[PDB]
Amino acid sequence: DMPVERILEAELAVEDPVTNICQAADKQLFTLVEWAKRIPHFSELPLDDQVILLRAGWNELLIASFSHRSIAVKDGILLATGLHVHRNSAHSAGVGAIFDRVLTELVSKMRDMQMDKTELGCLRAIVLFNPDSKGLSNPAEVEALREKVYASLEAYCKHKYPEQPGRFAKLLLRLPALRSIGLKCLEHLFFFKLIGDTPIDTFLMEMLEAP
Amino acid sequence: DMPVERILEAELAVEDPVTNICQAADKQLFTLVEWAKRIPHFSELPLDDQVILLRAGWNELLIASFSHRSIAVKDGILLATGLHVHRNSAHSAGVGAIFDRVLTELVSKMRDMQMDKTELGCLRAIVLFNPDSKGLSNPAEVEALREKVYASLEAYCKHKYPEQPGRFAKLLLRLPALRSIGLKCLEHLFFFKLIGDTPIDTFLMEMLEAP
Amino acid sequence: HKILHRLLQD
Amino acid sequence: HKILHRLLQD
Ligand SMILES: COc1cc2c(cc1-c1cc(/C=C/C(=O)O)ccc1O)C(C)(C)CCC2(C)C
Ligand SMILES: COc1cc2c(cc1-c1cc(/C=C/C(=O)O)ccc1O)C(C)(C)CCC2(C)C
């Protein structure tokens, strides 16, 4: 069983620029673990599988969250630290292109369709339960949990937005953009580490370790 | 209007290891242009937009095609040149990990759900009509075409496989894997170019040019 | 991107 | 991955 009510509850329960951005990322990794434990059935997976799923998904999970947090922000993002970061600041820090991808492919699209918190929660749970994650002791089990989330999401969309038959597909079709953006943000982060100027705190640094 | 019959027709109309793989990729780029022209409304987009969409999507488009071609192959892929490439050969050429991702995230999953050619065609058309592609003269127009494809795909799935209510979502949820795999294959290709040992023919080389 | 443009033209 | 394991334990 995978009730959207429980997923919404998980979201509600947890509610230069590059230095501040990395600080926010590290901060939210702690909260991300708290979020995942509140998603039905996650805590009952083997510990090693919970580790695999969070290591695979954390960046996409956190990016989805800050993007949705930013829907009422004009040309910017709102960090978990309470700092608003504008386009101009990202551009003047040498990270304009990737910032603009976040704005155009995620934030603006979330804004334009008025993606709600239940929908965001469900998309994040789908990302969490990624059965393609390498090393899972039982991928089939994770696949089944993903299937339950998306079944519940579709039923939710059909019930709440009956006049929008395309909405469920529209939600799912932001996931390729999220995947690509997560990968690019990760690439930048490895570079920040490599150059060694930008402070990277312990949890964020741990996520940059090899498996 | 976006009939699945026309999309199926487009598919049917076009029907060391690394050197052979690159040869196949270049070969299929020519055929890919022929495929795209057969997808409803693509040829009526501005020429520059057709260029943008193919430059953005070609790798995902070609990977989806060879993966589906390979569903009856055991632990391998069948290239457009008629060469079967086994896991062992990819591994012994230093590209095992990415090859295995193709097998486990695409080929095996296509096999297990018996993804048909209409479904493959529709997923490819969705990839083709990517409204997030940078520089499009009218992203809204491309978005509308994507929406028509996925509406037609859902109706098709509901009609042909009524006993599989999750199937449409299942299809769409291979797109993040396809995105990630496309990016990784591209990264390898840029490396082959950089090292300069592997022959890369003209069309494949053109795809590696800056915009 | 001359090959792509040529093929898409006709 | 000691931080993640510790947090997931409790
Ligand atoms: C450190 O991870 C990043 C890097 C970036 C960016 C974001 C993040 C990042 C931030 C967070 C912050 C989350 C929050 O404040 O809730 C989480 C994961 C992340 O990968 C954006 C897209 C804002 C700008 C480009 C860069 C590469 C500097
Ligand atoms: C040159 O593009 C590649 C590279 C790879 C690979 C595939 C391709 C590739 C092949 C094709 C061949 C298509 C066909 O034969 O129909 C098209 C686009 C591509 O990116 C696989 C996943 C097979 C193995 C790893 C490497 C990185 C060598």
Side-chain angles (χ1 to χ4, degrees), chain A residues 37 47 50-51 55 203 206 209-210, chain D residues 1-5 7-9:
Chain A
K37 287 173 161 184
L47 174 58
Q50 298 179 42
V51 169
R55 288 186 52 91
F203 205 168
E206 184 176 292
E209 291 175 8
Chain D
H1 327 305
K2 70 181 57 199
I3 300 159
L4 188 57
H5 283 266
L7 295 170
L8 282 166
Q9 154 230 7

Side-chain angles (χ1 to χ4, degrees), chain A residues 39-143:
Chain A
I39 296 296
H41 312 294
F42 178 83
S43 288
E44 286 72 54
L45 292 168
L47 174 58
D48 294 330
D49 289 343
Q50 298 179 42
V51 169
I52 285 159
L53 295 181
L54 282 163
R55 288 186 52 91
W58 67 272
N59 215 16
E60 290 176 38
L61 292 164
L62 294 186
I63 289 158
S65 292
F66 77 69
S67 293
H68 190 266
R69 195 186 303 123
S70 302
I71 58 168
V73 182
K74 184 64 192 300
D75 303 318
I77 63 170
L78 172 52
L79 300 175
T81 56
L83 183 69
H84 295 80
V85 174
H86 190 268
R87 264 193 98 236
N88 294 346
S89 181
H91 274 272
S92 72
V95 294
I98 183 59
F99 196 90
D100 281 342
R101 288 197 64 191
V102 168
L103 295 181
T104 63
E105 301 174 29
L106 303 175
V107 179
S108 294
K109 302 217 174 184
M110 291 173 169
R111 181 189 297 121
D112 290 350
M113 77 185 295
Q114 292 289 100
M115 181 191 288
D116 69 38
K117 290 184 180 174
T118 297
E119 298 170 320
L120 172 76
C122 287
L123 284 174
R124 294 179 82 222
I126 288 164
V127 168
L128 179 68
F129 294 135
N130 179 358
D132 302 298
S133 306
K134 305 305 163 185
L136 290 171
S137 73
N138 188 2
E141 184 182 32
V142 174
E143 193 182 54

